[PDB]
């Protein structure tokens, strides 16, 4: 499900 | 058991035959896995390589026949004359 | 295409469809919806039943 | 339209192999230039703004010519595939 | 010659000027040439006015007002003529004087600014673009307002539907579900229709007995009683459930948006909007939608009418709400103007969000003129919209009746926001409504039926697009001679009587009388009859108006009859047609074919070239006449002069004529000479055989016109010139090439021959070995240079007739990116008529030219004279279009008695009167013979003997009585001219007026043998010269397949298109003399494999035993 | 052979299939004006009665050509393989009478005209529904055909 | 990758989704190389993750597009394979025959069914080679090539080509084709009589056949260069040789309109 | 010569897939402008996927038929004309895997 | 960034082009002519130069896109060939 969310969530 | 005429093609042996579809993504994915040989049967599969149609005069019944004149007819029993070891 | 008895190597297949598909464009014969019915068709006529079947 | 295309249509087991036949005979019947022909001295192929058919007009219109006349043969497996070519190549001259 | 016209229904009032729907619209829509004092603020004035006050406040500082003051144009870069000999659009200056505030010191006002330019209308209709007359399309779409639709799924109950235009403006629908939940889906999901109904103070006590007390639905409004209890807290709640992140206390935040300025408004205060609104539901609603501001307090003038309709829908009997989607009281037109305003405003848009950044990037006070405003937006979507537009396309100008229909067609297809492409069925159909506002036959044929119409000859929009159309007025017996233009809506509203209903003056004549209640034919009474039809004419469009006997014409037919004249090729010895249906000069008149005088006066020079008028004022001007010009089309126009020297001329009447334009009226053909009857197999189908005494008086001859182009392409291998240098074999090719260059004007220029040189380098990078050591043999010092030459396309092309160079120093042209200079070469042909050619009457017997045959031997009258055409019969039994035989025994009368006709639609000529004009006929027929001194040919009275027998004639009566009965019917004897021997039995002959039809390049009879082919595929393609290729289908393929034709199939699949490796040995092989080469493969599979291979996806073929076998021979293999 | 206007001939029995059909339509409006039939009676009353009437004269008109003129061109065309659907000679000699709506159900009033004499107005643009409701399904069974035609050789050719 | 109108070029969006994938993948190496922080090992091995899609097939999960001028699908793979777009259907849709010519067709009354007439001009380009080659063989050209440049310009035949012409053509046919081929019938194979004009004389009797009246319909000539093809064409597909419906017993060439209205 | 009589689709092993490589892809480089060359190891390539020119070479070393079947030194370009350029082809050897989103989907 | 590979010597530079092209667009209205941008520019600025140096600053038009009446025929078929014979 659409990656660039997850990416800045993970960095978060 | 009775199928509908197109679920009736789209589920045939050869893939070549079952990918000139609009699905050809599930018939190939299936086809791989498989190692499925196309024996080219059909004649549409039969088209897509570039063969010779199976059918008309691409049937093997007659693909493959001979002629020849009765004064050759003769030359090739001297061709069978000549075998005798001298 | 004669009348003698089929040919062997022949496109018996093919020639079938075809047969069967070009006639095709001359068929159908109505229905709709009158004036409020209780009720609900049965003759489906036409190509569209062909399909059906 | 075709001379006797129905008793060239009956000398076969199906209408295919005619063709075949007809065919295979024609392509032979230039492979090997003009002279492999199966019948020629009288009444045989012709053409008009001069006599000319006589020597290279239609490939099959003879094969078709000769084929239908009872003088030519042919079969399902009647002489061996490459000693054909040979003796052909070797008794009828025209390159 | 003489003109009897027919039948008599006094038609009231003239035809309307049959451009209006263009040319009139346009300009309201860009009022140019009235100040701005003047008292009209739509199209442009209202998107501008709309589009400026930019009151962007606070996000920093700023506070900068700017408003509009005075658009205006004035002078357009170039002339109209000029606009199409280079290549540009045909503008018009367009700025207004701007000004802004500082909430400080300074209110600089920078006037003219010119944010790009707007396309011009023609006096005739169309713009012009890059050379290329056009035309914008006329399009329908759903009436704003409201309407309440049968629930989709529900059998039960009807939803509702608000719809506003712009798309901006909220798609709104209505629908309840009682157990609990209502529904109103706005944007998207549900919510309580109270929710928004407490919005605006509506609390439920007014609302549930003020409102639908007479409806027991009030319990579906009453529910959610917890949030029917605060006033201005619904405005948040609600904005609550929505969903973005925003902050629950932006005041008067986004139901501003539900207000006034941009979404839910529709063009002007009146009736852009309320028309719908109001008339149908409701009674008012102040500013244009929900609108208001000035108070906080948000009224809603909306939505307590739509519940209080939907409560009044869904039960009792109002009356019968239901609505007609399809009822023209409910679709609407948009002219060529509203097309224009809005993708005028979708400018303003990216403009105005362009300028709001510029607010925070200026410095100071240097910043009203450009470093606020750009051009850049406005001018590529303005263009952008007549460039591509969907809705916009060339001008189909074989003919002015062409031009004309086309200008005035109506399509569906358009915006995208309005009807698409999968829908139609009923959308198709032709309406109780169409009846006077489109016709009922126009419409194409195919995948676009219906979605494509041409409207009525009476028919105008208003005011606001609902097709309205002339209706008179009657009192009790009394029928008014005023009319009154009637909306489709407003028209259901009475009884309204036919137009062929017998009169006494002003009183109708019979105690019952048709007329039609709302889409209902019904036999009424006089005293009911309230309105009355003006004349048939505005029942049909226009086109179908100039078709003969349209009454006795399946419908079906009129179609192509009413098409067939749109292909009518201008021919040079234009021609009026022996029977008129009244139109003929209203066409030509009003389309601009031929030149008229302004007012009185005389005549100084009548040139081939300018007509000058010598008005009685002292004045006298001179008129151009563009000769020999090219259309897009092809078909050439010119306009040859009428008028004589020092003539005493009388206003309005021509001076000269026009391409179709005979003596002023249309002319699309050549009256001729027919004999329908069945010939040897000639006319078998739909063929036609002629008599090329037709070619021998150059009657069916047109004159057609082609532009060939090429460029000096600045290729980084060396300029490309122009030169008269080819470099190989003679210089009997260059004979016409005179002039250095260029070709010579008037040089017969057939196929193959060099109608300009050129001269371009050979090889991509390098000379070439093999030819190394040729050209040294012979003269090494050979031009190295390629013969990139502009030659005639095979086909055929006529004689030079004019060029035009563009070298260097180019005057104001536009030569693209490597475009160094352009040539162009027109060449004209007078293309004679010979077979494989295509003719038709404007009943549809549409026949293709099959036989050319001499005089000498076809059907000849008893007295010498030959017919023309030979027509077969049995193309007329099944094409239910007897019209066709009745305009041929008129026709007839129409040549032995010298004299025209004209037969009005439905109102015209009947059987007996023309059965009295054929009498009158027979004897300038018979009654020379009589005095001439001779009797009855041994074979008319031969043919007579059949002649009864057949049944034609009255047993006993006198040879010479005998004949008149038959020539009545409109059959004479005629005699085979092969033979001498009469063709046994009457046949009928007459005047039937066939036009010719314009050839398609599809007709270029095209042939290849061997071409180019694709980069990519291989498969082949044509280009400038070489035909491209034949596209074998599927169908194709199993015809193939179905036969025996085994090879035959893979001879398509391979030699002639797939196989590199095949087709080249193939060439070869055949020039030499073998049979071709056994086919390789296709590349279409080897692209698959690749292709597939691209995919982690293996596809290895395989042998008898699963071994490989390699289909890209060896060339696969690593290193 | 040829065809001009009086070769599309009209039977005396026309006015009276007409005519005769026109009381026995009158008497139905009566058996409705009471309160006998019902509204949906009232109407299959009538296309029952013309739809007769119309199939009617298409006999007369045959009829009047086989026995008093059988070598007519129409005629001739029709009975011999040629060119002629009787559906066809009716619309031009004796009448096209009951074209439909662009609902379905068809109209109540016939078009008594026929293409021989003046096929009226309102007659006219009442038959033009047929028009497109004729062009669209066409449009459909020439694509659907060709559609099922693919099916078939693809279940097929092998 | 091709070279256009000057500076423009042109390149399968193929390209452009491959440079993608291979930029990232390099990126990847590079990064795990110097150090690596997890987060941003896995994000572009995410990132790449999609691109691998990418190439193989576009939407199964996400669009990518060119940078802005058109929002299009960079055509992947199955998408040409599939012909997800039409593709497949131009694909069977058959491709393009070398040997094509395509004009108006009109009765050829006295014709017989045995033949056929097409305008020489067509005839000419049609089995130009074929042509070539007797130029040769007759006096009126020396060489190939020659011969080539005799018939490149119409003002420049002699009017010895067109007995040339007539000459290869004895014996030889060719094939006509309808608009919709809905039978075997549908395509029909006569020896053409050289004609003139620029139209295609079609016999009266197999207009049946091949659905086709004359107002403007227009018939497809096919040239069969095998000796075996023509030899097979002129055999089992030579229009009289059909005369009967492959559909039912009734005949298919049988006496029509006009015809029928004599007799 | 051998008459091909079936066909066969199956999955495309590392090793099958390498095969069919005549290189490895290493860069994002189409064609740089100065020159309409392929760039270094890019897409486009003499040495990878096949020559540019004919039988000609990359730089000339070699320019004939005779030289057939033999490749150059300095460059590297075995050589039959264009048409090999269009059938060959080449891979990308990545870091960590992906599957084919036809079998995931 | 591009598919063809251009030096950041050449980019520096074309945005400065791409940016006179603005500065050009702000005054005059004709928008100019490869003299205007080019004197504009600077030193070495000729009139051959601009002109060459946009045709590069272009962008590869997609070999596949959507040709003449736009339905199902794709563009690259409209393309010839060379090296083959
Ligand atoms: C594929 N068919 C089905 O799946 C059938 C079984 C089912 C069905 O779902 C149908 C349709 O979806 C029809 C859609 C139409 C006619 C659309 C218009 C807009 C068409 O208009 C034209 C202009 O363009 C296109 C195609 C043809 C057109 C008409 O010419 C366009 C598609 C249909 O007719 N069916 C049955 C058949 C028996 C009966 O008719 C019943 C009421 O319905
Ligand atoms: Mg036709
Ligand atoms: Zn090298």
Redesign the pocket.
Known sequence: KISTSDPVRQYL | LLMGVTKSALSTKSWLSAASFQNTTHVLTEAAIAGKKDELIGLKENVILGRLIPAGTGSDFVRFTQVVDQKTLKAIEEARKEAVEA | SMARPVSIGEAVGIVAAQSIGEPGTQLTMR?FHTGGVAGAADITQGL?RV?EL | AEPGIDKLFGMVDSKYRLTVVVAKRAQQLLRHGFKNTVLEPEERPKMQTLEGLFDDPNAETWAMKELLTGRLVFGENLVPEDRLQKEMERIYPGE | MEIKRFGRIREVIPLPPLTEIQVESYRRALQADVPPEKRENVGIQAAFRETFPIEEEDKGKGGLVLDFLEYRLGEPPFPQDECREKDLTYQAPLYARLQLIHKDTGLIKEDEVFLGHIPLMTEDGSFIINGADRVIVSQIHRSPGVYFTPDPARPGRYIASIIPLPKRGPWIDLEVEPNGVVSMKVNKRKFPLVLLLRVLGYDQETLARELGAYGELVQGLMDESVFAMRPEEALIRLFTLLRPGDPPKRDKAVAYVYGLIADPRRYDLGEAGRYKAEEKLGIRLSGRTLARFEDGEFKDEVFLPTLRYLFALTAGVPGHEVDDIDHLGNRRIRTVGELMTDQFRVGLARLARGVRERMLMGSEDSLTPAKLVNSRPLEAAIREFFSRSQLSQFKDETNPLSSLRHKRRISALGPGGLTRE????DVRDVHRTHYGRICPVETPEG?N?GLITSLAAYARVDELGFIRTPYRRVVGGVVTDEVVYMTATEEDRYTIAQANTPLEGNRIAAERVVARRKGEPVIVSPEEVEFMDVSPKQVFSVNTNLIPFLEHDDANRALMGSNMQTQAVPLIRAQAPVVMTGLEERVVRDSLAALYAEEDGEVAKVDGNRIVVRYEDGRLVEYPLRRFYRSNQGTALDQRPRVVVGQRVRKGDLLADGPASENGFLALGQNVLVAIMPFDGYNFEDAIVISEELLKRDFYTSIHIERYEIEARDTKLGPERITRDIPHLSEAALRDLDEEGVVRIGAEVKPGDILVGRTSFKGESEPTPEERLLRSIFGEKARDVKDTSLRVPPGEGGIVVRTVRLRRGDPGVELKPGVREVVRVYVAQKRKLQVGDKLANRHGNKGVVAKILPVEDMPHLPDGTPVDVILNPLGVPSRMNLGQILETHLGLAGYFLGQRYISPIFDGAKEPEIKELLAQAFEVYFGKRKGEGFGVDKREVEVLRRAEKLGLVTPGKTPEEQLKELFLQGKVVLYDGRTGEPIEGPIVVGQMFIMKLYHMVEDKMHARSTGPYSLITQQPLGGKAQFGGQRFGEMEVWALEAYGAAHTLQEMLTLKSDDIEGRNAAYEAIIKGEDVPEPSVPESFRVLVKELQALALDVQTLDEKDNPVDIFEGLASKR | ITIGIDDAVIPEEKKQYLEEADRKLLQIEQAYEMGFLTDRERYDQILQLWTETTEKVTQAVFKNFEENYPFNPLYVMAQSGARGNPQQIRQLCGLRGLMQKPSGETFEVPVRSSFREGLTVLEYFISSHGARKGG?????RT??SG?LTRKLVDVTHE | MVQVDGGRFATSDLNDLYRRLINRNNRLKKLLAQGAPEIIIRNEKRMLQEAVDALLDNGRRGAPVTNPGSDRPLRSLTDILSGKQGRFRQNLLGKRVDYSGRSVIVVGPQLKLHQCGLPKRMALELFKPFLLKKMEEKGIAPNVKAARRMLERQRDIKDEVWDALEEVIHGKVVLLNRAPTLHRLGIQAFQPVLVEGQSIQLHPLVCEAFNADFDGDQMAVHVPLSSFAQAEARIQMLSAHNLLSPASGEPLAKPSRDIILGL | KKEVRKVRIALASPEKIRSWSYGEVEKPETINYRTLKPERDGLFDERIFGPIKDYECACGKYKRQRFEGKVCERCGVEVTKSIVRRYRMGHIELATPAAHIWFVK | ARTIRIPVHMVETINKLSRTARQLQQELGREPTYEEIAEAMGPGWDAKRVEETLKIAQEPVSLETPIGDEKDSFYGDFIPDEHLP
């Open positions: 229905t569209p399909i | 999968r829908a139609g069925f995948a039926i | 669209a399904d066409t449009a459909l694509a659907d559609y």
